Amino acid sequence: VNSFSGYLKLTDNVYIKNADIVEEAKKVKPTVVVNAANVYLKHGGGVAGALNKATNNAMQVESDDYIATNGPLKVGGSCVLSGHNLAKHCLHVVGPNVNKGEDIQLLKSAYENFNQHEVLLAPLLSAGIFGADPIHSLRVCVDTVRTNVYLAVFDKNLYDKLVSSFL
Ligand SMILES: O[C@H]1CCCN(c2ncnc3[nH]ccc23)C1
C-alpha cells in the first residue's frame, strides 16, 4: 500500500491520473519523481522547467555540478539526483526529442531506467514538447516498465484521450 490517490489502474503495475506532476510530488513526496530531462540537464521548459522552478532552481544548481563532473547523459540514459523539496530522489531520464530528430526507438531504453526503482511518479517520456505521440509513449511504458509507475498526465484532453484509447 502507498499514498497515491485517485489514479486509474491501467495494468498490474501502471496507474494514470490527470495531474500536475509538481503538485502531485508536493503532496505525495514519493521516493522517486522522474524528470523529463535532456542530456545537458538544462531544465528550461516542459516537465523539467516546472520541476526545477518548484525547487527554487536548486535542481538546476545541482545538475550543473553533475554535468561539470560527469559530462552529458546519453539519450535513453538517466541519473539519480536529489528530489529536493519534491521527493527523496529525482530520476532524470532522457527520452528522445523528436523535435531534435532523435531516434524514437530509444524510448524503450529510456523507460528501462524505471525498472531500477520499485515505485515511481513519472511523466510520459518524450511527450509534450519532446514531440512524440503520447499514446505511443504510454504503450512503450506499459510494455517496458515492470515496477510500479504512477503516470501524471498534465493535459486534460490528452488524459481523457489516453484513457479512452488504451488497449
Ligand atoms: O507538455 C507535457 C508533455 C508531457 C510532460 N508534461 C507534464 N506532465 C505532467 N505534469 C507536468 N507538469 C508540468 C508539465 C508536465 C508536459
From Swiss-Prot:
Domain named Macro: residues: 1-167
Membrane topology: Multi-pass membrane protein
Domain of life from the UniProt record: Viruses
Catalytic activity: Thiol-dependent hydrolysis of ester, thioester, amide, peptide and isopeptide bonds formed by the C-terminal Gly of ubiquitin (a 76-residue protein attached to proteins as an intracellular targeting signal)
Localization per Swiss-Prot or TrEMBL: Host endoplasmic reticulum membrane
Regulation: Inhibited in vitro by GRL-0617.
Subunit structure: May form homohexamers. Interacts with N protein.
Task performed by this protein: Responsible for the cleavages located at the N-terminus of the replicase polyprotein. Participates together with nsp4 in the assembly of virally-induced cytoplasmic double-membrane vesicles necessary for viral replication. Antagonizes innate immune induction of type I interferon by blocking the phosphorylation, dimerization and subsequent nuclear translocation of host IRF3. Also prevents host NF-kappa-B signaling. In addition, PL-PRO possesses a deubiquitinating/deISGylating activity and processes both 'Lys-48'- and 'Lys-63'-linked polyubiquitin chains from cellular substrates.
Name of the protein in question: Papain-like protease nsp3
Species, as recorded: Severe acute respiratory syndrome coronavirus 2
